[PDB]
């Protein structure tokens, strides 16, 4: 009698307790619930003044797994919450212990910034595959060590950020497949990306994906995903050209052709 389980801390993929989940299927890599995240280990707190979110992952946990977790996490209680995902709202279990707030609501993002992770493997799927804006900002020197083409299973590149002149890119966790460029960057390049991606204004959020590049697997690569997703509309021309140049440089011809056809098929705002 499997149960959906939302994890936000030490149970997330590639964290120290993740092995407790055993072979539980990951249903959503990208998920959130309204509430606050604190470093105490990590815990969550829910109150009626919450205006932000806790980010995490949804797994399908069997009874054995839930017993194991109950026994491991002494002093924690559990409840269910409504979890927002790229494919709808789900009800899932969550563990909590009744510390310092993590503004981002995202434990992995907190680990990255608070430990000054260096290097960062940064996965770009749109105009960050091109270099002209980097060059204008004086940061292209950080974006000259591409690992190269990288494949991401489970996501589609879609144009879900609505702006007045057209859409901007996103990746939706909808079971498709997509490509992008993985860069090896210093920690010191990160705040440029946070500004470009409007993190502080809740335009995009930092997010994490595992990708394949050069026959090798890279874990916990940083990317950015749209927060308020809308139906797709066409990107403006200037922006579309950036995507096209970067895709032509790095990505497979078959994928680049598909991406171009998708962009060109969309209705205008």
């Amino acid at each position: 009698m499997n149960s959906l389980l939302f994890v936000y801390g030490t149970l997330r993929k590639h964290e120290k307790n993740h092995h407790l989940l055993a072979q539980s299927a990951c249903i959503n890599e990208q998920a959130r619930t309204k509430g606050s995240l604190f470093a105490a280990g990590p815990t969550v707190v829910f109150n009626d003044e919450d205006e932000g979110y806790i980010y995490g992952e949804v797994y399908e946990a069997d009874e054995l797994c839930i017993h194991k977790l109950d026994q491991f996490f002494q002093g924690y209680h559990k409840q269910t919450v409504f979890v927002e995902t790229d494919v709808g709202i789900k009800i899932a279990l969550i563990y909590f212990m009744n510390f310092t707030k993590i503004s981002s609501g995202d434990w992995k993002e907190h680990q990255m910034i608070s430990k000054s992770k260096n290097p960062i493997y940064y996965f770009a799927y749109g105009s960050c595959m091109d270099n002209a804006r980097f060059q204008k900002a004086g940061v292209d020197h950080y974006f000259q060590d591409p690992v190269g083409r990288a494949v991401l299973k489970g996501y589609t590149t879609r144009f879900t950020l609505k702006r007045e002149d057209g859409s901007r890119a996103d990746m939706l966790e909808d079971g498709g497949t997509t490509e992008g460029v993985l860069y090896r960057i210093p920690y010191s390049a990160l705040s440029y990306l946070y500004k470009r991606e409007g993190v502080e204004s809740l335009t995009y959020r930092p997010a994490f994906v595992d990708v394949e590049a050069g026959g090798r697997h890279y874990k916990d690569c940083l990317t950015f995903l749209v927060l308020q997703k809308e139906a797709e509309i066409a990107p403006p021309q200037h922006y579309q050209i950036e995507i096209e140049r970067g895709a032509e440089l790095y990505l497979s011809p078959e994928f680049t052709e598909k991406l171009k056809r998708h962009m060109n098929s969309l209705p205008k705002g």
Side-chain angles (χ1 to χ4, degrees):
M1 164 226 305
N2 290 175
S3 300
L4 298 177
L5 173 69
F6 175 84
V7 292
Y8 57 82
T10 73
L11 295 172
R12 290 182 66 178
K13 195 184 194 180
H14 309 126
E15 298 286 9
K16 65 182 179 180
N17 297 318
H18 183 67
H19 64 273
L20 300 171
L21 302 186
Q23 305 305 105
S24 299
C26 181
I27 309 305
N28 297 273
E29 300 172 13
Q30 305 305 334
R32 73 184 191 176
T33 198
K34 180 160 283 170
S36 292
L37 183 67
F38 287 83
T43 188
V44 296
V45 178
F46 301 111
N47 105 304
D48 71 6
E49 291 183 307
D50 294 338
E51 318 305 329
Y53 297 88
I54 302 145
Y55 291 88
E57 301 162 20
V58 178
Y59 288 84
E60 174 97 303
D62 68 11
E63 290 186 43
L64 175 153
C65 175
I66 300 303
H67 288 127
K68 291 161 80 189
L69 299 182
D70 292 338
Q71 294 172 213
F72 192 88
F73 289 92
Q74 289 174 325
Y76 288 57
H77 296 282
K78 69 199 204 248
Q79 64 167 80
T80 57
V81 288
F82 287 106
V83 177
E84 294 167 27
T85 81
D86 287 3
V87 299
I89 297 180
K90 297 194 179 288
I91 297 174
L93 287 168
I94 189 173
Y95 286 81
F96 63 95
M97 31 152 133
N98 144 245
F99 48 11
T100 70
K101 186 167 172 183
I102 309 306
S103 90
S104 67
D106 189 325
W107 178 238
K108 287 196 171 178
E109 185 275 348
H110 165 252
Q111 290 176 127
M112 174 180 69
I113 292 87
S114 70
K115 303 270 197 23
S116 298
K117 178 175 182 167
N118 191 218
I120 295 297
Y121 285 96
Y122 170 53
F123 183 72
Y125 58 80
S127 77
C128 290
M129 301 188 293
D130 184 61
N131 73 163
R133 289 183 63 188
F134 299 145
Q135 289 175 145
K136 293 182 229 125
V139 301
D140 199 49
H141 64 90
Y142 289 136
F143 296 94
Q144 289 166 187
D145 189 16
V147 179
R149 190 185 304 173
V151 173
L152 178 58
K153 301 220 161 318
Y155 295 77
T156 308
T157 299
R158 293 196 186 277
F159 293 78
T160 67
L161 185 76
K162 179 283 308 304
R163 299 309 226 202
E164 300 172 296
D165 63 350
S167 63
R168 306 292 188 279
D170 190 26
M171 299 190 296
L172 195 66
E173 192 188 359
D174 65 5
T177 194
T178 201
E179 303 191 6
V181 182
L182 187 68
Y183 297 99
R184 183 182 294 101
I185 72 178
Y187 184 70
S188 63
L190 195 53
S191 66
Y192 164 77
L193 294 171
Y194 274 43
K195 178 186 169 203
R196 182 170 172 164
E197 305 289 359
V199 168
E200 187 191 26
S201 61
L202 306 179
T203 308
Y204 290 76
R205 60 180 186 93
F208 301 86
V209 292
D210 293 356
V211 305
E212 209 176 340
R216 177 171 149 68
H217 283 300
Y218 290 88
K219 295 177 181 311
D220 285 338
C221 298
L222 173 65
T223 196
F224 293 88
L225 302 171
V226 172
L227 284 161
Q228 288 61 77
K229 296 186 200 295
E230 303 195 44
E232 297 192 76
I233 68 177
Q237 179 167 140
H238 81 289
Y239 178 74
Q240 175 167 165
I241 295 164
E242 293 170 68
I243 295 178
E244 291 187 359
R245 280 201 299 253
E248 289 160 7
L249 181 55
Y250 293 118
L251 307 187
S252 69
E254 178 69 11
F255 178 80
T256 295
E257 173 182 34
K258 274 198 187 193
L259 180 61
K260 285 175 177 176
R261 283 182 110 301
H262 182 70
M263 293 188 295
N264 291 145
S265 191
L266 292 174
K268 201 222 178 43

